[PDB]
């Protein structure tokens, strides 16, 4: 049984093991290879900020929900073991800041100690009047697509750095299922005109000083679109943009702006951090995750995908709930085929 | 008037900062100086863990606590301001691990979004039990002392690499005032056989993904004789020993074992941490902290010495209620003078 996944950013690789290590035992034989143009630390995962937090207001499908659930446990269960930061997972607390009252979000209960913050720890913050704290995790996408390769490697999974031009191509390549984990670039092998890019630029600071996170939020300007602070295993991520449907994979002076400005006035003693780095990363945004499989026809196998797309500015957040998801879906197929 | 403030530790600038913005304004002349034998990076400030956090059980004078609680305040009406972090000063929070149930510390106000844990909280932490969650400050020592001497060095205030042999040596040099803030060694200049050093051993380390401070407790081995681990401005220290009586200025093998086994139990991570120093410390320990006011006579000259020392385990955060406290005594000695504050 030859599986292809297209696609080494969070997802693909995450995916990809899950796979290997639900059904390396049970089918032989099975063979894992993916496929991608770019692998760290060229991917979009890498440019992410590395935080688990979902978005502030619920999701349409509420599975997305429980996958979301289903990530952090997962992730949190690894601390207290001795490779927890060389996966790019370590615990941090932080804030949440808004210019006014609004409702817990869904996730509360998922995260630690979340509660609302009082009065004192307000004056803290002189631009906002209302607000969060809770505990989560750290988990920086450069440093887990290392992990997991590195994961993926030892058990003999196979890495391919090409384009792939089609679906067709890979099945006729020999492939009987494929994984599609393409990120924003999905409409290339299906156009999906649900499907844009969140494109956010980010800048990287020597700013060590800094523990916790803090993310403010401008309920007129939509999300991630006000600034952001968070703490890297070795770095600090500054944010402030988030804007849907542009392609431009440039840095932009004008974005630049707003975010170093927007971070100085939240946090001042920014003015003695050192930039080290600024990226622009597109986040695959879609109204809903596309997490579903497909059967496609080409001579004579009919060979099957299962897409895993489309997971905005929370891959990170979500992964591993999505890639149970994708396992599960898998063994069915395992079934129809009489496989065990 | 001529004041030297002995001690260029946390406690003696503090101090004589405090004086000096208190009263240069309706003092004229007033000349502040430093005497100390040692200056950043060789304090035992400089060694300090740096974190803001009293003794768990209550104070014997309940007067340190409101030190500490000013102290607090104090420092967290600076987080907001651009040169937080250039004082040495950060938010942090982080873990108070037990092996079981014990009373609220009576500084669970003090702090912020003190809580209990949570089971889950605990599935993080293996060998305990119960504990606390909170938010506090860093105040990194080395670098406060860095803010301290460029604050003072800008007002004017002078320091001077001086050995003090006695109090009347430096009286006789023509000091009305003197504030001792001498830590651990104020018994050569006058005997106080309550005052004790409280010998703690660290190790520096790279490990910059730890953000948050795990300090674990042994209630029967006594306080700070437990792994700690307190993430500081660009390093983490981490330490377990805090034995009282010893005078060993040299770091031993024994110590740096107990440290980092007991550290890399609590934090496994730390297998990749480079060490990058370790250090010996002396905790001016003391039932409680000596800060009043004594009339010295020589040839028939009043001296006025102000004490300010036996800070223990706690200097850092409890030094500016006690600086507070010392300027209110030097306005008292102003009075008697017939002098006038505000
Ligand atoms: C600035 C920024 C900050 C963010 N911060 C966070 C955060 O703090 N927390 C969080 O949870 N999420 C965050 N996100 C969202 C998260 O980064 C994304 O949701 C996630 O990285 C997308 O992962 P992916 O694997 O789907 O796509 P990518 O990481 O882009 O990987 C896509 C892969 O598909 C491959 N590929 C595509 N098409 C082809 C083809 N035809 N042939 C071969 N290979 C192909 C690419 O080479 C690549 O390897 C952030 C996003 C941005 C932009
Ligand atoms: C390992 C360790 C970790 C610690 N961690 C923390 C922590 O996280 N938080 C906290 O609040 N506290 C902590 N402490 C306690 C803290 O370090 C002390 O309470 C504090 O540093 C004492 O300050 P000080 O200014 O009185 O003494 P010091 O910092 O020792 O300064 C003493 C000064 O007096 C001078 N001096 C003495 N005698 C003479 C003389 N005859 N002539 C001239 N000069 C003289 C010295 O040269 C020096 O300048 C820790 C202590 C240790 C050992
Ligand atoms: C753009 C910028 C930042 C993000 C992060 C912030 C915290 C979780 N998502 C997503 C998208
Ligand atoms: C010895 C060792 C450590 C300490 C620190 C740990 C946190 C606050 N006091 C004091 C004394």
């Known amino acids: 049984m030859r599986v292809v996944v297209i696609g080494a950013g969070v997802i693909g690789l995450s995916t990809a093991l899950c796979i290997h290590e639900r059904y390396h035992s049970v089918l ?15 991917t979009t995962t890498d440019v992410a900020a590395g935080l688990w937090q979902p978005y502030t207001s619920e999701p349409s499908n509420p599975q997305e929900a429980n996958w979301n659930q289903q990530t952090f446990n997962y992730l949190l269960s690894h601390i207290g073991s001795p490779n927890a930061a060389n996966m790019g997972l370590t615990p941090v607390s932080g804030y949440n800041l808004f210019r006014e009252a609004v409702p817990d979000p869904y996730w509360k209960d998922m995260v630690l100690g979340f509660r609302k913050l009082t009065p004192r720890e307000l004056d803290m913050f002189p631009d906002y009047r209302y607000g969060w704290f809770n505990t989560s995790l750290i988990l920086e996408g450069r440093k887990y697509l ?37 990120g924003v670039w999905a409409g290339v092998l299906q156009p999906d005109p649900l499907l844009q890019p969140g494109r956010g630029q980010i800048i990287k ?40 449907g542009n392609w431009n994979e440039i840095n932009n002076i004008q974005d630049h702006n707003t975010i170093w400005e927007g971070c100085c006035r939240l946090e001042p003693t920014l003015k003695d951090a050192k930039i080290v780095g600024e990226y622009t990363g597109f986040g695959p945004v879609r109204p809903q995750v596309r997490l579903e499989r497909e059967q496609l ?3 004579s196998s009919n060979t099957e995908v299962i897409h895993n797309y489309g997971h905005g ?10 890639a149970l998801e994708v396992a599960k879906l898998f063994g069915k197929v395992l079934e129809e085929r009489n496989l065990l």
């Not at 992990?147 to 191509?169: A, C, D, H, I, N």
């Not at 000083?209 to 602070?229: A, Q, V």
């Not at 500015?313 to 999505?322: K, R």
Request: contains cysteine; aromatic residues 14%; neutral net charge.
């Open 313 to 322: 500015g929370y891959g990170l957040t979500i992964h591993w709930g999505c």
């Open 205 to 244: 600071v020597d700013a060590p000083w800094l523990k916790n996170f803090i993310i403010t939020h401008d309920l007129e300007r939509g999300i991630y679109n006000s600034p952001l602070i968070i703490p890297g295993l070795q770095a600090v991520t500054l944010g402030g943009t988030f804007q849907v």
């Open 297 to 299: 026809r080409f001579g």
């Open 146 to 182: 290392q992990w997991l390769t590195e994961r993926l490697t030892e058990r003999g999974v196979k890495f391919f750095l090409r384009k792939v031009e089609s679906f067709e191509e890979v099945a006729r390549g020999g492939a009987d299922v494929i994984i599609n984990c393409t």
């Open 28 to 42: 032989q034989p099975l063979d894992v290879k993916v496929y991608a143009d770019r692998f760290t630390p060229f």
